[PDB]
Amino acid sequence: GVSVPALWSEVNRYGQNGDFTRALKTVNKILQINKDDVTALHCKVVCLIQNGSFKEALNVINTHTKVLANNSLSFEKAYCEYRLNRIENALKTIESANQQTDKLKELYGQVLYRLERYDECLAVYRDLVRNSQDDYDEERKTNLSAVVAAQSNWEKVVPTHELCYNTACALIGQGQLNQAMKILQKAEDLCRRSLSEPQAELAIIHGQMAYILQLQGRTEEALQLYNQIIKLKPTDVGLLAVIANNIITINKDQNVFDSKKKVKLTNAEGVEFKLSKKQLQAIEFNKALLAMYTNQAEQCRKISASLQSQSPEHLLPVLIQAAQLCREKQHTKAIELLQEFSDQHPENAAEIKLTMAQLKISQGNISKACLILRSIEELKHKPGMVSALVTMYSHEEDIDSAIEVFTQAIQWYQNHQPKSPAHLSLIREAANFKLKYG
Amino acid sequence: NKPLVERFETFCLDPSLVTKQANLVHFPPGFQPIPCKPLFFDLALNHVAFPPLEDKLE
């Protein structure tokens, strides 16, 4: 037999040293010496968490909750279920805790980020980075910056190498591309400096290069950059899925071999947890297009329908099926499918009517297309739209209606934005059109 | 080349708008490229530590 205070001293020594496997083994020894000690159970669950076996730690907490009671180990089980992708349970675990602790606040911010509740997540992260001081403040700043960047990128509100990359992400969300490439080159420089003072952390920076290059139109450079990104074999899986998807978007119809080899990578292990809702939704969006383009229609319809199950979220996927019907010599069914969707949702209706009109310019029924285009309120005055409307009107000499559109657009602009460049363009061209035919 | 959806703030009587190749909208719709996700760190793992053992120490 050995003294229990000696075991506690040696456990503390092992914990301060950083060794956790042997510390766990001796915590097992002390707990088999004395089984009704709360501190031993807390130490062993901490050891299991740090060893990476979250399942065993959750098992220990659940099967010893009866003996635990008292203050409860809420934070440890919340973190264990978090790292096991049980975020919904982590919510109730944090909310139901007896008292609020800084560890609980940090975990609360992280789970709030993982569920895209960016308003509350940003607020709680602001409180964390304001009222709490430690030696991880730079990571707190990059976490808050990542929160803001994701919020701007997806929910679309105006706002070291990690900070620069996150600001590049925020600027990409804001649509600015050249300045994003500049700050990304700066982050590339800082990555090079830190790595010289290993290559995997490089690739992610390059990930935001080619996506910009593809956004700016420089497809040829972006494809080579993606090829070298994959040839580096990065350890990340979510970034591999993103890179594969962007290679799909660049490839479009051509180079089906790249497309299939990248779809082999888009659905990999752990992909669904690293990526967000919007990113996975867009990957599903791209899968259906690829399937229609080169794969059999039997799988094109399935993927688009599966996304349509998730469709009420965002990023209207009905058009994939509409285009597939148009590819199957069926246009009236497509028109009905567009029309019902337009009727169901009124806030999304405007932009989708634009797609209906184009179909009714395929071979005839132009006047109905002009009627649909006129039916898009808040967008009738827009100069491109008025020009297209007037030329379609002039196809079958529907003049007086064209002047009516001209004057109503003039009235709209003059009441809204008098003396506008576009409004003055409209008035001069309306005067010219009245001059032509009288 | 671009669809009219990207040329709304531009008045120009394009003849093809009255022909078969109207090109009002991307049909089939264009692919959706996604920006790479921002960088996020697990700062809760640094809080996983032993409780104060001094009350039950040697």
Which of A279, A355, A384 faces B8 most closely, judged by CB atoms?
Answer: A384
Nearest CA distance, B54 vs chain A (angstrom)? 9
Asked if A355 and A373 touch (Cβ cutoff 8 Å), the reply is no
- In angstroms, the Cα distances linking A405 to A129, A408, A426, B18 are 55, 5, 11, 17
Using CA coordinates, name the residue in chain B closest to A139: B41
Ramachandran angles phi, psi of A360, nearest 5°: -80, 20
Which residue, B49, B46, B33, B28, is CA-closest to A279? B33
Please name the residues between 174 and 203 in chain A that touch chain B, using a CB distance below 8 Å.
none
SS3 A317: coil
The rounded distance, in Å, linking the Cα atoms of A87 and A82 is 5
Please indicate if any CB of chain B lies within 8 Å of the CB of A331: no
Pair of tokens at residue A268: 């990999």
Residue of B nearest to A129 (CA): B43
Nearest to A49 by CA among A124, A103, A117: A103
What DSSP designation does A267 have?
A: S
- When scoring B16, B39, B42, B56 by the number of chain A Cβ atoms within 10 A, the one with the most, hence best to mutate, is B39
Question: With contact defined as beta carbons under 8 Å apart, do A369 and A361 qualify?
Answer: yes
Nearest-by-Cβ selection for A245 from B4, B23, B34: B34
Per-residue 3-state assignment (H helix, E strand, C coil) for chain B: CCCHHHCCCCCCCCHHHHCCCCCCCCCCCCCCCCCCCCCCCCCCHHHCCCCCCHHHCC
> What DSSP character marks residue A296?
-
Contacts of A306-313 with C-beta under 8 Å, sequence gap 24+, read: A307/A281, A310/A281, A310/A284, A313/A277, A313/A281
Rounded-to-integer distance, Cα A314 and Cα A317, Å: 8
Q: Could you tell me the maximum CA-CA distance found in chain A, to the nearest angstrom?
A: 112
A178 C-beta neighbours (distance < 10 Å), count:
10
State both tokens at A70.
Answer: 């008292």
Single-letter code of the amino acid located at B57: L
Choose among B8, B4, B6, B20: nearest CA to A331.
B20
Nearest to A323 among B24, B28, B50 (CB): B28
Measured distance CA(A243)–CA(A206) in Å, rounded: 10
CB A385 within 8 A of CB B11: no
Interface of A with B in 12-31 (CB under 8 A): 12, 15
First-last CA distance in chain B: 80
The experimental technique used to determine this model is: cryo-EM
What type of residue is B32?
Q
Position of tokens 């292990």? A269
Interface test with B, best of A75, A132, A391, A417 (most B CBs within 10 A): A391
Yes or no: say if A121 and A112 are a contact pair by the CB < 8 Å rule.
yes
CB contact under 8 A, A319 and B27: yes
Q: Dihedral, CA atoms, A330, A336, A338, A339, nearest 10 degrees?
A: 160
Q: Is the dihedral of CA A311, A312, A315, A320 positive or negative?
A: positive
Mutant choice from A361, A398, A427, A436 vs B, greatest count of B C-beta within 10 A: A361
Domain boundaries along the sequence of chain B: 1-30
Residues 6+ apart with CB under 8 A from A389: A370, A373, A374, A402, A405
Within chain A, which residue ranges are assigned CATH 1.25.40.10? 1-99
Q: How far is CA A189 from the centre of its chain?
A: 27
What's this structure's resolution in Å? 2.7
Rg of chain B on CA atoms, in Å = 30
- Using CA of residue B49, residue B54, residue B55, residue B58, what is the dihedral sign? positive
A 243-262 residues with CB < 8 A to B: 245-246, 248-250, 252
The residue type of A367 is: S
Interatomic CA distance for residues B58 and B56, integer angstroms = 7
**List of residues 6+ apart from B30 with CB closer than 8 A:** none
The answer to whether A195 and A202 have CB atoms below 8 angstroms apart is yes
Do residue A172 and residue B35 have CB atoms under 8 angstroms apart? yes
For domain A1-99, which CATH number applies: 3.40.50.2300, 3.40.50.720, 1.25.40.10, 1.10.20.10?
1.25.40.10
Which burial class, exposed, middle or buried, applies to A2 when counting CB atoms under 10 A from its CB (0-12, 13-18, 19+)?
exposed
Calpha distance A189→A168 (Å, rounded): 14
DSSP A161-191: HHHHHHHHHHHHHHT--HHHHHHHHHHHHHH
